[PDB]
Amino acid sequence: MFKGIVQGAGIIKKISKNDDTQRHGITFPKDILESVEKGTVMLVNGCSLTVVRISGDVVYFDIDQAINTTTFRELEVGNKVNLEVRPKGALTGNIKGVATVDNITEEEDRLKVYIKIPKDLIENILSEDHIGINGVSHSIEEISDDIIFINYPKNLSITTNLGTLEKGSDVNVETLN
Ligand SMILES: Cc1cc2nc3c(=O)[nH]c(=O)nc-3n(C[C@H](O)[C@H](O)[C@H](O)COP(=O)(O)O)c2cc1C
């Protein structure tokens, strides 16, 4: 299990597609880079994936088991992804659905994010529950029907991909408890 506190942002450097599988090469920050090796199981946008190789600061993962139930299929070279190495709140790295951002509102110190949750998940989500969105675990301010409202501190953008999100952005969600 993981904290759901993002350690740093990686940048997708390469994507190779070969038969309902994709290999993503992701440029890592040095500290996170020094904490991983081939075989490391870590969180990428909140999803458990296994490091299959490393070349320089580029860390590669094969997306195959996760390919139909995560946002990886739709990501592009240059996209930022959240990273967390394994040490509530606590995230397992089993993504429960792909949700879509409904609205992002930027204010002076906050990022107000509204996310349309898959219908199959909404019956077990109340306001004030913790939820993982791309591996950031934070509480829900409100839910009305299938839309959840999370109010993030804007400073979270220096260590995460939250500042890159807009309406229509898909996200990995992990429901807790
Ligand atoms: C130890 C661990 C390592 C995993 N490594 C990968 C992997 O490298 N590639 C992948 O596609 N899925 C991997 N998975 C599976 C994804 O985490 C999983 O498919 C996704 O979170 C949850 O979606 P699912 O239940 O629809 O499969 C791993 C799971 C675990 C527990």
Q: Which of 124, 125, 44, 128 is nearest to 91 (CA)?
A: 44
Residues annotated within the binding site for 6,7-dimethyl-8-(1-D-ribityl)lumazine are 48, 50, 62, 64, 66, 93, 95
CA 10 to each of CA 24, 77, 102, 107: distance values in angstroms, whole numbers, following the listed order? 11, 11, 24, 25
| Atom from ligand 1 closest to the CA of residue 172 | 21
CB 100 within 8 A of CB 170: yes
Q: Which of 87, 20, 71 is nearest to 174 (CA)?
A: 71
| Atom from ligand 1 closest to the CA of residue 64 | 11
Where would I find the beta strands (DSSP E) of the chain? 8-17, 22-27, 41-44, 47-55, 58-63, 80-84, 97-106, 110-116, 130-133, 136-139, 142-144, 147-153, 170-175
DSSP state of 28: P
The CA-CA-CA angle for residues 54, 55, 61, to 5°, reads: 35
CA pair distance 162, 33, nearest whole angstrom: 21
| Resolution to 1 decimal place, in Å | 2.0
3-class DSSP state for residue 125? coil
CB 146 within 8 A of CB 117: yes
Q: Which domains does the chain have, with CATH numbers?
A: 1-87 (2.40.30.20), 88-177 (2.40.30.20)
Residues annotated within the binding site are 31, 47-48, 50, 62, 64-66, 69, 93, 95
Tokens of 98: 């792909």
Q: Which technique?
A: X-ray
